[PDB]
Amino acid sequence: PMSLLARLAPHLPYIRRYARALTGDQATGDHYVRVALEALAAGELVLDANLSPRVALYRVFHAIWLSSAGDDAAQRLMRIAPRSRQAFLLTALEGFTPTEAAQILDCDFGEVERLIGDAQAEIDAE
C-alpha cells in the first residue's frame, strides 16, 4: 500500500538523531543507521507488523546493535563499583602496578589503594 521507502523516510532524520546521541558522533551514528537499512532492504530483518513503522524501525536498529556478555559484565561492574572500578581495572585487567595506576589516575598511592579496596569490597559483596 506504501513502499518501504515511503513508510520509513520521514523517520530517518529522527533515527539519525537517536543514533548520534547514542554513539557520540554523527559519522558513527549514520554507519549504524546504514547497517539497519541494508538489513531491511536485504530482507534479513523485517518490520514487526505489530508496531508502527517508526517503532518497528527502531526495533530493527536495536536488533542489529546487539549487547554481548562482556558488555553486560562491564555494565554490572559500572553499577557495583561506580567510583572505584577504574583502579581495579587498571591493575587486575590492564596489569599496571598500583604505583603506575596512581600516575594514570593522578592521585596519591593511598588514594589508589583505597579505590582498589572499595572495588574489591563491592565485588566480593556481589
Binding site: 530517518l12 532524520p13 538523531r17 548520534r20 532492504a41
Partner: protein
C-alpha cells in the same frame, strides 16, 4: 520524572533532524523491491 532533559536534548540535536537525509539511505530503501 518530568522530562525537561528531553526538551534540552532536542534543542542541541536540532541540527541533524533538519539536515537532508543522505542519498545513500534512500538509495538503500529503493533497493527493497
Amino acid at each position: 520524572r518530568q522530562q525537561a532533559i528531553g526538551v534540552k536534548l532536542r534543542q542541541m540535536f536540532d541540527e541533524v533532524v533538519n539536515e537532508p537525509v543522505p542519498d545513500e539511505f534512500l538509495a538503500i530503501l529503493r533497493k527493497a523491491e
